[PDB]
Structures are given as C-alpha cells and as structure tokens.
Symmetry: D2
Subunit: 123 residues, 4 copies
C-alpha cells in the first residue's frame, strides 16, 4: 500500500495532506490545516506498516506535524494515528492528539483529541 498511500488526501474539515510513502516505511510530506492557528503548509513525517497483513485488515500508520513554519508558530504538535483502507473509496481513518506547549500549571489542558477521516477526493 505504498502506491495506495502516496498522494494527496483531504479530510472532513477541508485540510490537505500531501504524502509520499517510502519502501522503507517512511511517510514524508506536507499538511495544510483548514482550521486553527495555521497557515500554508507544514512539514510532516511519519511511519507506516510496509508489509500489512493480507487478511483484509487495514494498514497501520501515523504522522506528526509541529505547527511551526515560515509564517506562524502555534507552539503545538499534532499526531495522527490510524489505518489506511484500500479500495474504490480509499480512506485513511485516524484519531489525533494535539499537544500545546504549556506551563506546568496548565499542563492538564495541554492536549486536544479528535478524529479525522481522509479521502482521495474532497469530501
């Protein structure tokens, strides 16, 4: 699912995930968020299972964006954890954790959680 994963994906919010899946298990690309303290593209890196099971299961993967680029720094990072599901309507189904840098006093409210589903057509 190297060929399955590589390309341009869009989530439910209208964000754009541009990724290359390497033969070695690497994910590399850019992320553009349609929401939050973000503008333009951000570097992403991650990993995927380059030898998934052949029993109809999805392909596990994850990636990170730190929300610093040449335009903005939101002092925060999101990780998406999920699986790719191949087929006519391919999907990447994820859950995510968005941690902000905080003082120790505020650390209890550091981390947002949510879920994004990515498709190969805007959605």
């Amino acid at each position: 699912d190297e060929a399955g994963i590589t390309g341009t994906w869009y989530n439910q919010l209208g964000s754009t995930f541009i990724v290359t899946a390497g033969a070695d298990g690497a994910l590399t690309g850019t992320y553009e968020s349609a929401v939050g303290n973000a503008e333009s593209r951000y570097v992403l890196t991650g990993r995927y299972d380059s030898a998934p099971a052949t029993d109809g299961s999805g392909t596990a993967l994850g990636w990170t964006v730190a929300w610093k680029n040449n335009y903005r720094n939101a002092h925060s990072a999101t990780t998406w954890s999920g699986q790719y599901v191949g087929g006519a309507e391919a999907r990447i189904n994820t859950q995510w954790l968005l941690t902000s840098g905080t003082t120790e006093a505020n650390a209890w409210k550091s981390t947002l959680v949510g879920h994004d589903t990515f498709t190969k057509v805007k959605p």
Copy 2:
C-alpha cells in the same frame, strides 16, 4: 531545546527512546518497547517546535513508530504527542495512540490510548 531533547530517554515501563532533534524541527531515532508485540529497536520519526515560547512553557513534539522491524511485524503504529520540559529533572510528558490494522468490522477496537512520561535516567 534541540540540545535538551537529543539523547536517550526512558519511560515508566522501561522502554528506551533514542532521539536526535535536528535544527530544522526533525526528530529521528529508534524506539525499544519493554512491552507488547515488540523486540529490539524500531525506527521513529517525528517533529518538534524548534522555536518554543520563552515564557516557561514546554516544547511541543510528537513522533511515530510503526511496529515492523527485521524481527517482528505487529501490524500497528503508535504516535506520541507531548511536550518536553527542561531543567534538572528534564521530562517528556506524552499521551499516545496505538492503532492496529483491523478489518472494518473490528475497527471500533483498533486504537489503544495511554500516557508515557520519559526521563533522562531510568526511572
């Protein structure tokens, strides 16, 4: 906190996180889990805020491991999302999401969540 982050870290379970923080915001290294369907080291990649706030807040970061190496493939990936907190007892405080590849029928039980705290001395 490039110099702060780079090095060897240990969590509460006795896992080993070996990371290099690049000037450009990259995290690269290896992870060895003391638990689960894992043996030896696994590639990791991630990102961190290379220009954190200077108001006493932590440094946001995240990374991914896909649990495939030359020994084992657990058809799963974990992402850690958290912040580095500098000082005498430096810490990386994370929450994580562990997604397994599943059938669509089993996707509701695909994802474990937990929390790991890393220190520079075993802990």
Copy 3:
C-alpha cells in the same frame, strides 16, 4: 435540551442508546452494543449541561456503562464524552474511552479510544 436529548438514539455501529434527561442534569437509561463482549441492555448513568449557552453551541454531556448485566460481564466500562447538537437532524457527537480491568503488567493496554455519532434515526 432536556426534551431534545430524551429518547432513543442509534450510533454508526447499530448500537441503541435509550436515555432520559432529567431537569436536574441527570442522564439515566440503557445501552445495547451491536459489537464486542455484550448482549442485551446495560445500565447507564451520566450528566449533561441543563442550562447550555444560547449562542449556537452544543450541549455538553457524558455517560458511563459498566459492561456487567444478568447475561455477561466483560470486566470493562466505557465513558462517552460529547455534545448534543439540536435541529432537524439532531446528533450527539462523542468520543469514548473503554477501560478493561487488567493486571498492573497489562495496564498499558487497558484502554481503547474511539468516536461514536448518534442520530434519532438508524443511520
């Protein structure tokens, strides 16, 4: 949104959530899961904001099921945390945490996380 919330709801998996919202903020009812180690109905209790904002925001709420009834005991409990969104296609959008009782050794893999969306018509 007492009248909005009270009634029968269905999620994406085909589970059935039967709830009464009390004037005092209580949620009481039964839950029937279409998946997992479950059969028939389970007691639920929870709470909701009985005086939500009037600026178009949702109504925050949560509830718990312990997966013990007269038929089965899965030694586990789920909590749903979310918001009710009123209107023609009313919805309750949740994220959930499913904790199993474990030994200390296995506690790192105790907790599943996911997301359920409930509608007033099967869905």
Copy 4:
C-alpha cells in the same frame, strides 16, 4: 470492591472525588476540581464492575461530571474511564475526556484528553 471504592479520593492536581459505590454497580457523589473553570462541588454519577475478576485484575469504572452547579456553568463535561486497584496504596487510574459545548465550526477543538491518578491520601 464496593468497600474499596467508597470514600474520599484525591488526584495529582489536588482535586477531591467523593464517591459511594452501590451494590448494584452505581457510583454517586461529588467532585471538586482544583483547576479550570470550577468552584465548589459538582454532582457526579457513574458505574463500576460490581463483580470483578479474581485473577489480580483491576475493577473497571467510569463517571461523569457536568460542570454546572449553583456557582458556575462551564458548559462542559468530563468523563473519567479507568480501574480501581486495591491494596495498601489503593489507586484509581483513569484517563479522561473533557468536552466543551462548541459551535459546529469549533467542534474539532471541543475535547481535551488527560489522565488522573487518585489515591486515598493527598498525594
């Protein structure tokens, strides 16, 4: 673990959880948060496994607080999902989800996630 659970508990933040475990699986009590948009006590309700396994596993449980009382309304609800672990240093180890009521536009940032550990002595 009815007798184990019933009583006064304290988390790492200095919050106070006062609970009664009923023979029927109910949890009822009050919660006082040391942080956030909160003052004084809030109603809680939840559920626990009233017939846990006898193999050394913990007792699964969960509860909800809606953050409305006679003093304040934060238009939000937290659910804690976790397990009770009996013994000399009894503990309840939880993960939590704090959902705020939001507009649809802001729903992606509705939910905080974290972890609380409760002990029978301040901690």
